[PDB]
Structure formats: C-alpha cells, structure tokens
Amino acid sequence: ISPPSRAQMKRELYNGTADITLRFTWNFQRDLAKGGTVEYANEKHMLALAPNSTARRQLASLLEGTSDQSVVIPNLFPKYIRAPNGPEANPVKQLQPNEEADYLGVRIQLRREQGFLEWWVIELQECRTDCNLLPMVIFSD
Amino acid sequence: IIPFTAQAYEELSRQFDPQPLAMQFISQYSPEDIVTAQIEGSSGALWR
Numbered sequence: 001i002s003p004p005s006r007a008q009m010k011r012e013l014y015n016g017t018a019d020i021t022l023r024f025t026w027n028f029q030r031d032l033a034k035g036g037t038v039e040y041a042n043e044k045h046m047l048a049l050a051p052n053s054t055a056r057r058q059l060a061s062l063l064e065g066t067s068d069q070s071v072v073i074p075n076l077f078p079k080y081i082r083a084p085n086g087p088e089a090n091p092v093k094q095l096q097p098n099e100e101a102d103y104l105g106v107r108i109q110l111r112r113e114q115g116f117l118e119w120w121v122i123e124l125q126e127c128r129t130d131c132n133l134l135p136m137v138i139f140s141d
Numbered sequence: 142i143i144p145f146t147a148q149a150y151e152e153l154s155r156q157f158d159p160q161p162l163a164m165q166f167i168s169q170y171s172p173e174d175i176v177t178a179q180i181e182g183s184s185g186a187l188w189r
Contacts, residue, residue: 002185 006063013059015052022047024076028138041083041138043090045103047076062110070107070123077106077124077136084141092139100120104136143177150175 001009012018023044025108030039038045049056058069096102105125124130145153150172157163167175 002183005183006185 010060010063013052013056017051019048019050020056022049022076026078026084027083028089030085030140032033036085038087039085040087041085041089042082042087043081045076045078045100047073048100051064051141059108061139062112065112067110070109071141072125073106073108075101075103075125076107077104077134079104079136081136081138082141083138089138095139104134106134142179144173145175145177147172149177 006066009014009020012020023046024046025042028039028041029035031039032039048060054059055071055073058071062071064070073099078089078091078096078099081089081090082092083089091099091103093099107123107127109121109123109131110118110123121131122134124134143149150170152165153175154164154167157167
C-alpha cells in the first residue's frame with residue numbers, strides 16, 4: 001500500500017470514520033475445454049469495516065506497529081458455494097443459512113516482522129491448519 | 142469508478158457542446174453510461 005495511503009488506511013482503522021470495502025472476491029476460474037462460458041465464477045463478499053470496531057481496532061494496532069492482532073471477521077469465508085459456468089460465486093443458501101453469518105469464521109493476521117517484512121496470513125477464528133490452508137468447498141455445476 | 146449521473150452527463154455534453162461530434166458522442170451515450178476513470182496514481186508498489 002502506497003505509504004501516504006497506508007498511513008490513511010492506518011488512520012481509518014485508527015480513527016477515520018469510514019467503511020473499508022473488504023471485498024472478498026472468490027474468483028473460480030475453471031476451464032473452457034470441458035465447457036464453461038464465463039468459467040471464472042466470482043463474488044466480492046464485502047465486509048464494510050465499521051469505523052474502529054473490534055476488527056478495525058485490531059487492525060489499528062496491526063498497522064500501528066505490532067503484528068499480534070487476530071482481526072475478527074464475522075463469519076465471512078463461504079464454506080459451500082454453488083458456482084456455475086457463469087460469473088457468480090454465490091454460496092449455497094440453507095447450506096449456509098445466514099450466508100454472511102453462516103459462512104466460516106475467518107481471521108486475519110498481518111505479520112510485520114521487521115527484519116517491516118509485512119506478511120499477511122489468513123487465519124480462521126478456529127485455525128487448526130487454516131492459517132496456511134483454509135479448507136472451504138465449491139459446489140460446482 | 143463513478144457511473145456518471147444525468148447531471149454529470151449534462152456537464153460533459155455542455156463542455157464539449159461547441160464541437161458537434163464531441164457533444165454527440167456524450168449525448169448519444171445514455172446517462173449512467175459514461176463512466177468516470179478515476180485511476181489511482183499512488184504507488185507503494187515498488188518496481189522490479
């Protein structure tokens with residue numbers, strides 16, 4: 001992130017009352033050999049980041065200097081997606097009833113280990129091995 | 142990216158109204174058609 005806008009991103013999470021667009025685009029590029037017009041089935045699962053929420057205060061400290069903040073993203077990792085040959089990664093409703101609150105609790109961890117060496121691990125609220133390998137599912141069509 | 146509104150479209154059309162074909166392009170394209178290219182210029186991405 002460009003330094004001035006990184007400081008502005010900081011500020012948003014720090015104070016700036018805005019809602020960061022957390023578009024979790026779930027692009028599913030298939031193929032065209034077996035068919036699949038718009039193979040890439042994509043859906044930006046956005047999470048408007050409430051100004052300085054629990055998640056954004058964790059992100060405030062994340063971008064302040066520390067790298068030990070588990071950012072709570074309220075169940076936003078679709079664990080069952082009815083994707084077809086069109087451009088939509090729409091999750092199965094009922095599989096995930098709330099489908100925004102029944103996806104899968106996802107967490108984020110920026111690992112700025114100055115040596116800032118800013119990495120970014122996508123953890124889970126219950127990360128067992130899903131900090132390096134998140135296992136969701138795509139109900140393909 | 143800003144989908145230009147009806148009022149915004151009028152502005153562009155009037156800006157280039159002297160030139161007939163310029164205005165024509167804008168006016169012919171339906172409102173909420175002409176989109177705004179607000180391309181980001183800030184970097185951060187160093188180069189390689």
